């Protein structure tokens, strides 16, 4: 957007300084995020993606509930900056906008630099699961239906495949056939939720590493951010998605596949932190499925990238024509290694569960 428009958006909100700049910020794929610099404090300005989140009112009700509950326990969270009229967000010229205080003195990662960071991530998201269990499902309505319903995601993929809108399928048969051939594996968690053998828990559902901010001095988790997909699910969704993004030795969109590997050391680090917090609640069946949840969420995210590629990149932000194809290829590479290292990851979980 133009500065004129963005500065105009900013004037709707109860900011506490003269705005000097509003610049695109971050590696989030969904909302459109800006850093607001002023003569004092910083802010994050976001245009919410209403094609993905059509029910802005319900989305903001969830964010308000989660954040206000954290605040009421003296816990740092996202601080909504209200409109100058006291609302939690603003509809302006057909767009939905919100502002958060910029969370200061923090660092974040798109790639794990060492095991300690990822262990801390595990601890933080494990703790967040405990926090979220204080809510019952009825308080947090789904912001996106079938969000980690992998069989449903596969129906979406198959439809995108069959339509082949852009004729992109011809260049990615190996990737397509990978997802088609794994179709038998996609229902394991949904089946478990449906018949009661996996508990339905309130979950974050987007636990990739760059949705948590760590303190720049202590290295401890300061705040879990990107609260848009908090809703009922399985613990396995949060665990698996974290492993997907953070147990890789490479970026999500790394072009050079030789750099992309699944790290059992990073798997162990995260699991130690995560299970460490949830040992009192984790069931036998959840523990059994922890390794495979890595596979599952990586395949789900990968199929979604490839579906988006086949549909002309309508869902995820992209920087170049092949971006989603590049992303799907890292996810496949990771799953190939997770399959190969299945016995090691089983052993790692078994080991951590006793200790
Ligand atoms: N309150 C905040 N303080 C500092 N940084 C933030 C804040 N909120 C978001 N960010 C940064 O902006 C990025 C994108 O925001 P996010 O809510 O994750 O958007 P998306 O939904 O598009 O992923 C985050 O990954 C993080 O780096
Ligand atoms: C609401 C939504 O679709 N979020 C996506 C999206 O997360 P963001 O933090 O919003 O960029 O990109 C992820 C892949 O990087 C994917 O796993 C996730 O489900
Ligand atoms: Mg995000």
């Amino acid at each position: 957007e133009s500065n004129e428009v963005l500065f105009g958006i900013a004037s709707h909100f109860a900011l506490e300084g003269a705005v000097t700049g509003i610049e695109p910020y971050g590696d989030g794929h969904i909302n459109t995020t800006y850093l607001v610099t002023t003569d004092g404090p910083r802010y994050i300005l976001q245009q919410m993606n209403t094609s993905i989140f059509p029910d802005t009112v319900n989305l903001m009700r969830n964010v308000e509930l989660v954040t206000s509950t954290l605040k009421a326990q003296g816990k740092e969270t996202l601080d909504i900056v209200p409109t100058t009229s006291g609302a939690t967000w603003a509809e302006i010229d057909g767009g939905a906008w919100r502002v958060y205080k910029f969370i200061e003195h923090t660092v974040s990662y798109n790639l794990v630099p060492n095991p300690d960071v990822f262990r801390e991530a595990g601890s933080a998201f494990g703790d967040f699961q405990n926090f979220l269990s204080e809510f019952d499902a009825s308080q947090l309505t789904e912001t996106i239906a079938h969000f980690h319903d992998t069989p449903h995601r596969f129906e979406d993929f198959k439809a995108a495949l069959a339509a082949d809108k852009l004729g992109r399928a011809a260049a990615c048969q190996p990737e397509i056939d990978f997802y088609l051939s794994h179709a038998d594996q996609y229902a394991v968690v949904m089946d478990g939720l449906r018949d009661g053998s996996i508990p339905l828990r309130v979950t974050h559902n987007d636990t990739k590493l760059n949705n948590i901010l760590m303190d720049a001095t202590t290295g401890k988790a300061r705040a879990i951010i990107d609260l848009d997909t908090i809703m009922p699910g399985s613990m396995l969704f949060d665990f698996g998605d974290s492993i997907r993004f953070g147990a890789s030795t490479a970026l999500e969109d790394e072009k050079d596949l030789s750099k992309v590997h699944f790290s059992t050391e990073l798997f162990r680090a995260y699991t130690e932190g995560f299970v460490g917090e949830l040992r009192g609640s984790i069931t036998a069946r959840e523990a059994e499925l922890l390794p495979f949840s890595g596979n599952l969420l990586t395949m789900e995210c990968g199929m979604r990238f490839l579906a988006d590629y086949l549909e002309g990149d309508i869902y995820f932000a992209t920087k170049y024509p092949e971006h989603n194809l590049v992303r799907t290829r890292t996810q496949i590479k990771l799953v190939q290694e997770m399959e190969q290292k299945a016995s090691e990851t089983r052993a790692i979980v078994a080991d951590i569960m006793e200790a």
Side-chain angles (χ1 to χ4, degrees):
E1 287 280 21
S2 79
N3 272 350
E4 190 200 55
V5 169
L6 290 168
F7 277 62
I9 300 298
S11 67
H12 284 75
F13 294 90
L15 306 189
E16 301 189 284
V19 179
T20 61
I22 302 175
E23 300 296 330
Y25 186 100
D27 297 301
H29 296 145
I30 300 295
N31 296 139
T32 308
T33 299
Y34 303 84
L35 171 67
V36 179
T37 58
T38 80
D39 56 3
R42 285 171 280 270
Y43 302 96
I44 290 290
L45 173 68
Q46 288 189 322
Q47 183 176 2
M48 281 171 278
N49 183 326
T50 58
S51 78
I52 298 170
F53 297 109
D55 189 348
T56 309
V57 174
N58 177 72
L59 170 61
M60 288 302 311
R61 182 170 293 122
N62 284 4
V63 176
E64 167 62 27
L65 180 60
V66 172
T67 57
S68 71
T69 305
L70 288 167
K71 293 173 190 172
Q73 295 176 16
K75 286 173 180 174
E76 178 179 12
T77 184
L78 287 168
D79 286 310
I80 290 161
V81 177
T83 73
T84 51
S85 294
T88 58
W89 67 284
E91 181 69 15
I92 309 172
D93 297 322
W97 295 84
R98 65 191 176 191
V99 174
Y100 300 124
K101 298 195 184 169
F102 189 89
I103 299 180
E104 296 285 343
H105 209 264
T106 60
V107 294
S108 71
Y109 304 93
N110 296 328
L111 188 63
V112 170
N114 59 66
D116 295 326
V117 166
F118 202 36
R119 189 189 326 280
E120 177 59 26
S123 176
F125 281 117
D127 179 64
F128 204 68
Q129 288 261 172
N130 286 324
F131 167 73
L132 290 177
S133 72
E134 300 164 26
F135 299 110
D136 47 42
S138 67
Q139 297 180 269
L140 294 158
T141 295
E142 53 174 41
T143 49
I144 303 174
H146 302 110
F147 189 64
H148 289 313
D149 176 349
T150 310
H152 191 93
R153 295 293 196 176
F154 186 58
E155 294 297 317
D156 287 347
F157 167 73
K158 287 192 290 172
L161 176 60
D164 191 22
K165 184 174 166 163
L166 279 56
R168 289 177 157 182
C172 58
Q173 294 302 112
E175 293 78 15
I176 286 161
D177 290 352
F178 175 89
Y179 294 113
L180 292 169
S181 72
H182 286 69
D184 190 67
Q185 300 175 3
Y186 299 148
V188 64
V189 178
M190 296 299 301
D191 283 356
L193 287 170
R194 273 189 287 269
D195 72 3
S197 77
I198 298 173
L200 190 65
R201 303 181 188 283
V202 175
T203 51
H204 181 279
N205 300 294
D206 186 13
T207 62
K208 67 167 162 187
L209 186 59
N210 65 25
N211 291 327
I212 186 150
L213 304 176
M214 250 65 38
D215 190 77
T217 295
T218 73
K220 304 297 167 192
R222 282 270 305 288
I224 290 171
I225 62 170
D226 199 344
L227 303 178
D228 292 341
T229 57
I230 294 166
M231 62 185 129
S234 174
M235 164 194 307
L236 302 170
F237 298 162
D238 285 5
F239 183 87
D241 211 18
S242 279
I243 296 308
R244 174 193 75 77
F245 188 87
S248 173
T249 57
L251 290 172
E252 188 180 65
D253 55 1
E254 174 56 59
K255 286 189 162 80
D256 186 353
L257 252 26
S258 62
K259 299 187 172 187
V260 179
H261 301 285
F262 169 61
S263 171
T264 52
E265 168 157 74
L266 294 182
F267 184 90
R268 173 181 283 284
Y270 184 88
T271 305
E272 282 172 345
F274 189 88
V275 178
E277 301 296 326
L278 289 167
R279 189 71 193 79
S281 70
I282 188 165
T283 71
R285 183 51 172 162
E286 286 174 321
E288 194 172 20
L289 288 172
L290 283 176
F292 187 72
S293 74
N295 296 225
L296 183 59
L297 274 288
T298 305
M299 287 189 296
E300 191 187 86
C301 195
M303 72 180 343
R304 292 168 63 199
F305 290 141
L306 182 58
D308 206 32
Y309 178 66
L310 296 174
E311 297 180 283
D313 312 302
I314 58 170
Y315 191 94
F316 296 105
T318 57
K319 291 177 202 71
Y320 55 98
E322 303 275 82
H323 206 165
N324 277 324
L325 178 56
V326 170
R327 290 165 173 159
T328 203
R329 284 172 174 158
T330 71
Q331 306 308 93
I332 290 173
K333 178 68 181 297
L334 287 166
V335 177
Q336 289 169 333
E337 295 202 0
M338 290 178 191
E339 289 174 334
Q340 204 267 344
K341 297 161 183 306
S343 60
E344 297 188 29
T345 60
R346 293 149 180 159
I348 288 156
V349 171
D351 187 64
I352 293 161
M353 286 279 297
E354 91 182 315

